[PDB]
Scaffold this active site. Structure first.
Site: not given
Lengths: 447, 447
Positions: A122-124, A240
């Site tokens: 998802l993130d990353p 981020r």
């Protein structure tokens, strides 16, 4: 052509990945340290096989890796897994960041003719696909990315967020808490900036996204590499980070100042002693009475207001640290607290998960004009006990499963250590995720 | 003993009420001005019958009321309905407040031997049951209610709240907007206080409930009668109001200052003219260009910051008031705007509803100590198009249906014009709602 995959991990995300792969006719052998763990995450699932495997045993790992076409690492061991895949010449897919040790194996991976696809969770993962999609759209239009911000968070749905941290742990709370000690590096006013410690949380200010939510945002990990990765040389601000709910920064600070996050092992925290004594000892209270402990806590800690103070104190009491409740003895203040945290702050039956991911781009258009655009994804998980997927499990596990299918069929054919850093890789990934699973980020303008 | 009921209303809440009653073997004739409207809200529902009926026609109303054992008024006409019920000697149930005209019929109702149960929806209704339950618990313990606050709001779930007002209209937006003109009266520092106009919205400050939500709260209607109704003579602060999301107060003000809420009919708003001209005319802009209209809007309106301004302006643009989009001609600035509001801010397929209700009591305990306690209810509706109930429909319609069943079987037997103002009436109601439908408010302490 019946492909088979070795899946490493006994966690949250494993299920969606397993379901998607087996539903595609792909056989998966689920490996955990324990056979039980594997038996669990695999019971009733067609085309799956559970096994006990010691990933740290190089000889044992190689033997098992060779029996499959690709190894999936959802576990903590990354370089080790990649080295085995290199010796056995099998592909690899992970949902983790490409580390210096992983990149060091890039050339060896290419020589073995294998693909090592990372950062596809998802993130990353999803975040990369849409940040790059938007940046390229802007650039194609001759625009300039002056600021790039990206925040993401896996949280309790607001409905079930009423606890001291507005947070529910899926994974070790000890990890979450200690991570707040990590330094974050990012670009601000065109210059590299570092932030860590209390400072990190002191900087976590309210961050508007949608009217209904009350988020706070703060920098996470290293954002500096992205000036190059996303090719936004013109960007003065690149950040981020993560999202939390209002109040999180403040309760964390009190826990710090009270010393509950101390890694130090105490001889008095070896047996199941009532929470009273523990805190009174850890805090330095004249007694184990609420009055004293509370008076020591407040008199030493600073708050925004009497109400916040009142609220935070009630939150501490809610944890049960002022009660006759015996502790789950762990020697450490942090460890002991975490045991109770685990118990008091978990997702329970009927409760829902929530994932909020949002990129923000302040743009200077070709016409000189300016605009602010966002790329967002907001998704709730299925109620615990309903059998469906949590938002976090789905958004990490499905992208991973899709990448696995693409490396196996050739859609992703670049060899070496990769990340979803370009349209050659990203477009197929976004198309499948959106068209088949309805997973995507939607764009909108403001300013 | 097959009871039958006359249900008045062609709205949102009708379905759950209809479903619950018919599922109990109770026959319901659904009456709307139009047969179609009735045919709609009744198609496929067992034991129901749709009809066209003019509620304002006294002779026609009496004829139909006499054919049933009880009349349910979910429509706007209350005293008129009660007068017919009095002549025909049938019972009545409504989800509205007891007005002076309704109370005036109290003695006549008692002489006709009928029960007129009002204020049994969500708010008024469920809120009364739990505010009184808690107050009595406190008093039983010898405590004092020094402050009583109650806020409730039917809003879009956060997930689907991304519009200028963080609000979605179920009923006429014209009504919602005009209601913001109403004065609110309440107790503050032991004295009657009145607030209305911009002042009302200028007072709508952030109000903490749960970490995940960003609510603002403001007084609504008349709270002064409650010092007596809830028997809290010792209360210095008594306030009942509504919840909205962050940003609502600010967008409403801009709409006001821009003059979009003017009731005045303009000769230039009679034909489908592009939104540009409309706004430029309504606003007093040098042209129909975004620049001019926007420059006039900002230069005249005051904001909290450049960002809020930027956000609010983009919100206005989002409405489409600066576009080539032809207007839905309604002569009035407010009316015209509302048509577009209706279209742009409605719940769409897959979207969810959200009801937040919370009572707050600052208490002085028998031991002299103090504490703050809350009684909360937070519920999401079923996705539009899923066939399930929205939170608002369920929480208004079910309590109403339960009251209807209790008046029909004798559980509620007091005659006259009533409200759920005591345990004799409230306990049975709370027990059925919680045990059979899981509807209830949960208590928690703070401070």
């Amino acid at each position: 052509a019946t492909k088979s995959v070795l899946m490493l991990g006994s966690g949250f995300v494993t299920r969606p990945t397993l379901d998607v792969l087996t539903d595609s006719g792909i056989k998966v052998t689920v490996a955990c340290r324990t056979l039980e763990s594997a038996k669990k995450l695999s019971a009733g699932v067609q085309h799956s096989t559970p096994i006990s495997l010691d990933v740290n045993d190089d000889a044992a790992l190689d033997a098992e890796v060779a029996k499959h076409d690709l190894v999936i690492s959802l576990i903590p061991f990354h370089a080790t897994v990649i080295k085995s895949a290199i010796r056995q010449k099998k592909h690899v897919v992970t949902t983790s960041y490409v580390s210096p040790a992983m990149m060091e194996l890039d050339q060896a991976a290419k020589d073995a003719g294998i693909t090592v696809m990372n950062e596809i969770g998802l993130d990353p993962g999803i975040d990369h696909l849409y940040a790059i999609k938007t940046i390229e759209e802007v650039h194609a239009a001759g625009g300039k990315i002056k600021t790039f911000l990206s925040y993401c968070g896996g949280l309790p749905a607001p409905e079930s967020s009423d606890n001291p941290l507005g947070y529910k742990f899926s994974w070790s709370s000890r990890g979450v808490l200690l991570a707040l000690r990590n330094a974050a590096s990012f670009y601000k006013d065109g210059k590299v900036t570092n932030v860590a410690g209390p400072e990190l949380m002191a900087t976590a200010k309210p961050y508007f996204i949608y009217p209904g939510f009350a988020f706070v945002a703060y920098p996470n990990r290293d954002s500096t590499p992205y000036k190059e990765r996303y090719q936004i040389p013109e960007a003065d601000n690149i950040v981020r980070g993560t999202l939390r709910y209002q109040g999180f920064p403040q309760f964390i600070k009190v826990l710090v100042d009270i010393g509950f996050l101390s890694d130090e092992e105490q001889p008095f925290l070896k047996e199941a002693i009532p929470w009273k004594e523990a805190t009174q000892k850890i805090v330095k209270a004249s007694s184990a009475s609420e009055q004293d402990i509370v008076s020591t806590i407040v008199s030493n800690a600073t708050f925004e207001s009497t109400e916040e103070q009142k609220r935070i104190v009630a939150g501490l009491k809610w944890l049960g640290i002022f009660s006759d409740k015996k502790i789950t003895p762990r020697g450490n203040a942090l460890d002991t607290l975490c045991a109770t945290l685990e118990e008091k702050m978990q997702f329970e039956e009927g409760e829902r998960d929530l994932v909020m991911l949002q990129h923000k781009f302040e743009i200077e258009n070709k016409d000189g004009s300016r605009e602010t655009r966002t790329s967002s994804l907001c998704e709730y998980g299925a109620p615990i006990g309903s059998g469906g997927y949590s938002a976090m499990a789905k958004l990490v596990g499905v992208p991973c499963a899709v990448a696995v299918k693409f490396v196996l069929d050739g859609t992703i054919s670049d060899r070496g250590v990769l990340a979803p850093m370009n349209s050659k890789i990203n477009d197929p990934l976004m198309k499948e995720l959106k068209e088949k699973y309805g997973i995507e980020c939607k764009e909108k303008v403001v300013a």
